[PDB]
Design a protein around this ligand. Structure first.
Ligand SMILES: *[C@@H]1O[C@H](CO)[C@@H](O[C@H]2O[C@H](CO)[C@@H](O)[C@H](O)[C@H]2NC(C)=O)[C@H](O)[C@H]1NC(C)=O
Length: 361
């Protein structure tokens, strides 16, 4: 089983303990660590933060304590417009140029592969996404001839039924991708003003409207579309989505007036690092959707939907029973990397909870 762990570039700028550098990562923890967001300029992959080469080096030295460890670099992300990806991939000339620029970059900085985070291809992009994966992989095979190890190629895909039908040809890109990561956590997406859990596991059978929103539906679906189990990796979140209530009501359906107030370290609306959530729980009321097997908490006029050690131990357990390739964890930096925020003395409590279940066969 694989344990893919995303690490983000901008977690270095957080104040106090919130700050995080590749330095704090346990090398023996995950199998694959995906460094977050490279960029594109003049049609070639390129750096993003001023000090990326430095940090590239720090992350890639962990492979010195753990040789089994594999690291990849990711291109795209939410704050990277899709029109941008879309326009590189639809002109074979600008496309072929980006591809050729990739292997040497990865090699110079010591990455074992590249990851595509084209955040949401559209109806008009399905065909080019395919071209890009196909051609990119071809380029990696041809390059392994120089007698060095073949660079890995992966992709982070949407888990929303309508998004998968609209922009992905799952059957095709699964042939060329080393693994596929399922973004199974943005379900109660950005819109609608009702309280709800962003990463529920099941249908929460007490809910009738949207069955397409949950890890289970998403997974079954991808399998039907043709992606093979041994390439699928299920996304697990390490952050919580927050709302500012608009009434005394706190149960399913309750009205929302907007996002939740920012975390003291995370500084961003509607979001909360896990270590922040640990502090938050003090004086907070905790509840747990039995149906979807995921917890939520309220305190004041704030309602937080999140994932704890056991809702996570559970998602992990599902993943195994359906025989998938492994689990993907979004942001080791959003977890309690110091281990001084969530009661117990453990470091990376959530990510290691997943690793425990994954390591028991
Ligand atoms: C990522 O690469 C992009 C595209 O190369 C960089 O984009 C910009 O470059 C110019 C100088 O700032 C601007 O005039 C343009 O707005 C812009 N091109 C676009 C958006 O089409 C961008 O700087 C890079 N991002 C970072 C953080 O370096």
């Amino acid at each position: 089983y694989k344990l893919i762990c995303y690490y983000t570039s901008w977690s270095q700028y957080r104040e106090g303990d919130g700050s995080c550098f590749p330095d704090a990562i346990d090398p023996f923890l995950c199998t694959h660590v995906i460094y977050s967001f490279a960029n594109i300029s003049n049609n070639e992959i390129d750096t993003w933060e001023w000090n990326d080469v430095t940090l590239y080096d720090t992350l890639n030295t962990l492979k010195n304590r753990n040789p089994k460890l594999k690291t990849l670099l990711s291109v795209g992300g939410w704050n990277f417009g899709p029109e941008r990806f879309s326009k590189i991939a639809s002109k074979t000339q600008s496309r072929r140029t980006f591809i050729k620029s990739v292997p040497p970059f990865l090699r110079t900085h010591g990455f074992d592969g590249l990851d595509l985070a084209w955040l949401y291809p559209g109806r008009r992009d399905k065909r080019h996404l395919t071209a890009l994966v196909k051609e990119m992989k071809a380029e990696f095979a041809r390059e392994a001839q120089a007698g060095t190890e073949r660079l890995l190629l992966s992709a982070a895909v949407s888990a929303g039924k309508i998004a998968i039908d609209r922009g992905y040809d799952i059957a095709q890109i699964s042939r060329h991708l080393d693994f596929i990561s399922l973004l199974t956590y943005d379900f109660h997406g950005a819109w609608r003003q009702t309280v709800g859990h962003h990463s529920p596991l099941f249908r929460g059978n007490s809910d009738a409207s949207s069955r397409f929103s949950n890890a289970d539906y998403a997974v079954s679906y991808m399998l039907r579309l043709g992606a093979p189990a041994n390439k699928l990796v299920m996304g697990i979140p390490t952050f919580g989505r927050s709302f500012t209530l608009a009434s005394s009501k706190t149960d399913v359906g309750a009205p929302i007036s907007g996002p939740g107030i920012p975390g003291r370290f995370t500084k961003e609306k509607g979001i909360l690092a896990y270590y922040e959530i640990c502090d938050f729980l003090h004086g907070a009321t905790t509840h747990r959707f039995r149906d979807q097997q995921v917890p939520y908490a309220t305190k004041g006029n704030q309602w937080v939907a999140y994932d704890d050690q056991e809702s996570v131990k559970n998602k992990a357990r599902y993943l195994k029973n359906r025989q998938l390739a492994g689990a993907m964890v979004w942001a080791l930096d959003l977890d309690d990397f110091r281990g001084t925020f969530c009661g117990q003395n453990l470091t990376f409590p959530l990510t290691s909870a997943v690793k425990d279940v994954l390591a028991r066969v």
